[PDB]
Amino acid sequence: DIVMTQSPSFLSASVGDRVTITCRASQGIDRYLAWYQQKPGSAPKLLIYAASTLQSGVPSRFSGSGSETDFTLTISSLQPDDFATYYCQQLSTYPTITFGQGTRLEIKRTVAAPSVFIFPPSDEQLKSGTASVVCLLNNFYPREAKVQWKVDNALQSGNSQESVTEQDSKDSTYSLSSTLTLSKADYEKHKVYACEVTHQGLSSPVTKSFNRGE
Amino acid sequence: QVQLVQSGGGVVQPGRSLRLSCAASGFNFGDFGMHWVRQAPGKGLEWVAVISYEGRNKNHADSVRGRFTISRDNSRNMLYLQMNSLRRGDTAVYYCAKENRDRNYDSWSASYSDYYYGMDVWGQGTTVTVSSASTKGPSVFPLAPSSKSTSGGTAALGCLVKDYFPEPVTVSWNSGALTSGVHTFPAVLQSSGLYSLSSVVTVPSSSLGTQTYICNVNHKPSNTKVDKKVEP
Amino acid sequence: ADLRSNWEDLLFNLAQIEKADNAAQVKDALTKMRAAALDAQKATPPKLEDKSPDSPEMKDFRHGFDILVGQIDDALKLANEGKVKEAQAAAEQLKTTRKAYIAKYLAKF
Numbered sequence A: 001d002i003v004m005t006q007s008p009s010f011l012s013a014s015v016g017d018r019v020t021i022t023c024r025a026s027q028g029i030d031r032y033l034a035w036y037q038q039k040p041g042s043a044p045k046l047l048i049y050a051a052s053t054l055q056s057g058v059p060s061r062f063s064g065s066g067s068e069t070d071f072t073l074t075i076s077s078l079q080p081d082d083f084a085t086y087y088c089q090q091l092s093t094y095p096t097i098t099f100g101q102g103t104r105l106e107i108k109r110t111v112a113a114p115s116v117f118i119f120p121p122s123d124e125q126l127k128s129g130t131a132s133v134v135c136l137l138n139n140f141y142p143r144e145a146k147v148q149w150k151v152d153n154a155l156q157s158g159n160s161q162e163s164v165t166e167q168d169s170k171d172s173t174y175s176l177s178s179t180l181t182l183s184k185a186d187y188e189k190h191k192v193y194a195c196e197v198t199h200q201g202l203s204s205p206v207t208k209s210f211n212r213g214e
Numbered sequence B: 001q002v003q004l005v006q007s008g009g010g011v012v013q014p015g016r017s018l019r020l021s022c023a024a025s026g027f028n029f030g031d032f033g034m035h036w037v038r039q040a041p042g043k044g045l046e047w048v049a050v051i052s053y054e055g056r057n058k059n060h061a062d063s064v065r066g067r068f069t070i071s072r073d074n075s076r077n078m079l080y081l082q083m084n085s086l087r088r089g090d091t092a093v094y095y096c097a098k099e100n101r102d103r104n105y106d107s108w109s110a111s112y113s114d115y116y117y118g119m120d121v122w123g124q125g126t127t128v129t130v131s132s133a134s135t136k137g138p139s140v141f142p143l144a145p146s147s148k149s150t151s152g153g154t155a156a157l158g159c160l161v162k163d164y165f166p167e168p169v170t171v172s173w174n175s176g177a178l179t180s181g182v183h184t185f186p187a188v189l190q191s192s193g194l195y196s197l198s199s200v201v202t203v204p205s206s207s208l209g210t211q212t213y214i215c216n217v218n219h220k221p222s223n224t225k226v227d228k229k230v231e232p
Numbered sequence C: 001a002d003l004r005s006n007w008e009d010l011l012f013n014l015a016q017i018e019k020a021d022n023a024a025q026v027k028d029a030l031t032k033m034r035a036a037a038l039d040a041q042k043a044t045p046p047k048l049e050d051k052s053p054d055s056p057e058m059k060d061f062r063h064g065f066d067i068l069v070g071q072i073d074d075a076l077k078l079a080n081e082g083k084v085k086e087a088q089a090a091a092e093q094l095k096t097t098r099k100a101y102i103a104k105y106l107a108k109f
Helices: C003-018 C023-041 C056-080 C084-091 C093-101
Strands: A004-007 A010-013 A019-025 A033-038 A045-049 A062-067 A070-075 A085-090 A103-107 A115-119 A130-140 A145-151 A160-164 A174-183 A192-199 A206-211 B003-007 B010-012 B018-025 B034-039 B045-051 B058-060 B068-073 B078-083 B092-099 B119-122 B126-130 B139-143 B154-164 B170-173 B182-184 B195-204 B214-219 B224-229
Touching: A004 A085, A010 A019, A019 A085, A019 A103, A033 A062, A045 A062, A045 B119, A070 A085, A085 B045, A115 A192, A115 A206, A115 B154, A130 A145, A130 A192, A130 B139, A130 B154, A130 B195, A145 A160, A145 A174, A174 B195, B003 B092, B003 B119, B018 B034, B018 B092, B018 B126, B034 B068, B045 B068, B045 B078, B045 B092, B058 B068, B058 C003, B078 B092, B139 B214, B139 B224, B154 B214, B170 B195, C003 C023, C003 C084, C003 C093, C023 C056, C023 C084, C056 C084, C056 C093, C084 C093
Parallel strands: A010 A103, B010 B126
Antiparallel strands: A004 A019, A019 A070, A033 A045, A033 A085, A062 A070, A085 A103, A115 A130, A130 A174, A145 A192, A160 A174, A192 A206, B003 B018, B018 B078, B034 B045, B034 B092, B045 B058, B068 B078, B092 B119, B092 B126, B139 B154, B154 B195, B170 B214, B182 B195, B214 B224
16 A cells, blocks of 8 residues: 655644645655644544645645645644644545554744652552552653663663653643553562653753652 | 534454444435544554445455445435454544545536545544453552652642553542642553553642642542542 | 446456455456446446537547456456456556546536
8 A cells, every 4th residue: 555654743833933744655646635634632624635725614824735746735824723733645546545644743932841750659559569650750841851760770661651741731841751560579679769861951861769668 | 514423432342343333414425435534542543444425335444354344324324334353453533534525526526526635524533442351440549749759849749540441530639629730641551451640730839738639530430439638 | 327336336446456365356346347337338428418429529438438348358368367466467557548538528517
């Protein structure tokens, strides 16, 4: 099947910026390409079809172009309503249809350092055979943030799951939770557990850490 | 009003089957091809199937062919997706969608007007969760305001909502009154098959001795409610 | 059959040919395309209702289906000989022929 590759996957912009999103087809699809907008919790919305035709009701600041294998979608001057994920869709091989992987458009703002907190396992949870350590990175920007868990200066992977909020309504920052899970037999096998955080807004990586009995 | 209203879905175990429905109104249903499209948790749109205006011609994506069957009943303005041999990878929100006709064309004109011009009207989406897990209420542990959950001006505290199924839970803090500086994170699916999340709030170091903070968790699929208060 | 149903038989069955892994699927799809093409060849497309059967457009319409059926029959003979991928390759030209010879006569009026 034809592969649609959108670029970039993520980009930041401010209200009033001119924004360009590209899609690239693994082979020629003439002009049979459509663009969609999707916000979380809602269905996609058709913006453009036949590569350049504006669906009725879509504001004129959206526009599309391209032929054969290279296509772009342009927003002349952003509005707050336009922060969303955008998908291209090729229909040249109808009735086989394929989508691009999407491009998320986010609000740009100034670098904001994460305020980092760590929480020890509450021992109601201890009495039930497993321990979870949680590290919180509050209200940071940009999204790119590296979190590494040190247990007694020995670092891990394959043992940690993380989650991120969406860009905040008020201040356009992100927050991130990293949860480290162990069987409590191994939880007090060891001694120190550290949450090391790398971020653009921190001069040097920050590690806030606990010890069993902290 | 041109619209598609979906019904069906829910939690279904692997290898079993489910039927999605999509009721259309406000347009000539039997003049348009119809599609199913799905979106797995946190991922992009994936095209699933299409059926011709008449129901005589259809096609399905490689990933569902032989297990999913699109169909329609024009006399009842109904579109169906019959899903058999369900796999955990089929967990998704499923959308039905009407084929768009190019606006220069009032009626069918083969490839000038139909097929190649996207999908203009979408249903509201139906969640399908394929899991062997059983309905279980969460366990709720505090994230106590430490002396390391410190900023010198504002403290952070929260609640760990561990091990529940299925989605969703709801979290409030002291029953609706505290809403500034709240962050409830998206649930993550554990290898266990159950979900878990954390909710946190940042408060002034001032209020750790003058106001109480309780998180109210609610998991309606299990009818379990827990109000667990968070202090040092 | 309705002209739209015949048109859609040529569209949807090309996908069945491209995804096939055995001869039976290819011949079943080619056989439906043949019947759709012969039935549509008997029709009067809506933009040609003012025209005599001896007009260049009507002759052009009817004979474009002759080109298509000839090409369908070449693919079909390969599929009957068990040459699946040769038959699949030969079926790729059907979309080109359909656009170049038939599509324009389906525009409204």
